[PDB]
Amino acid sequence: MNSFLKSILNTPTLTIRDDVTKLPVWKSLQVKKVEIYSPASVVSKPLATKDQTEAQVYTEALDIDVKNGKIIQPVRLRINAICPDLSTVESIMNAFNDNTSTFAITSKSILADKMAIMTLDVDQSPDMLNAAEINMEFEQVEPPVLNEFDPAFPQDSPTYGVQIQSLSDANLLDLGAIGDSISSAAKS
């Protein structure tokens, strides 16, 4: 039953990373069940069809209509696990309370990313005096669209327009232009 003899390319090791720091968070979080639900939404009303056209000129029209009529809802995870330490629970609670939190849950072979905690249930019962059961839920904040993007570089970055509205006057030890001139001539 040697559970350390895990598979090589289907390793049953849950690894919740952190998209900011790329480090494993909440180790020693013995996991008992993982459920990955990925929904979608199809057309409900009957689609129209314009027949009396040719072979394959109907095909791309139908393909575009089908590409146009189904909307994807991103993934939710439900991890049921057993926390042995108070440090892990405090970290989980603080991460949940933090408004901004994106993690990358890697299940047996699933690599779902940009994932945020939705609900967290901590059950303390007389049959588990030490440790406590955790039922945590996750929702994908953003599907993994590939940012083609203009990288590697401070420069070559796309121009983003910050439309400022009202301009503040000034502060510090400044007397109009003479203050500005002294500050500039300070060479600092």
Binding site: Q155, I164, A170, N171, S181, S188
Partner: protein, 106 residues
Amino acid sequence: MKKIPLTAVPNQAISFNAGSSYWKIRLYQNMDMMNADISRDGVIVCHGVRCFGGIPLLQYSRQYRPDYGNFVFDRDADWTLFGDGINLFYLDGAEFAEYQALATRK
């Protein structure tokens, strides 16, 4: 003397109503320097103005009378220290004339 908010990004474009005019400066990192594209009231005033500390942006009189103002960097432009350390200030006609008078006798 009005301080223009900045954001620590390499390339950006800021449009605002200052001094009875609609200014728009696009600041971008060009190699090891910074340049600015300045457009007033839609019509573009100048391109590729290399940015320095204390040195006026609109360098030519045609671009700043009658009392149109000017933009001045306290230090040499560096988008890494934008917001915290390097500020850009706008001067109306009178304040910029006084700045010219002070800076032309140094």
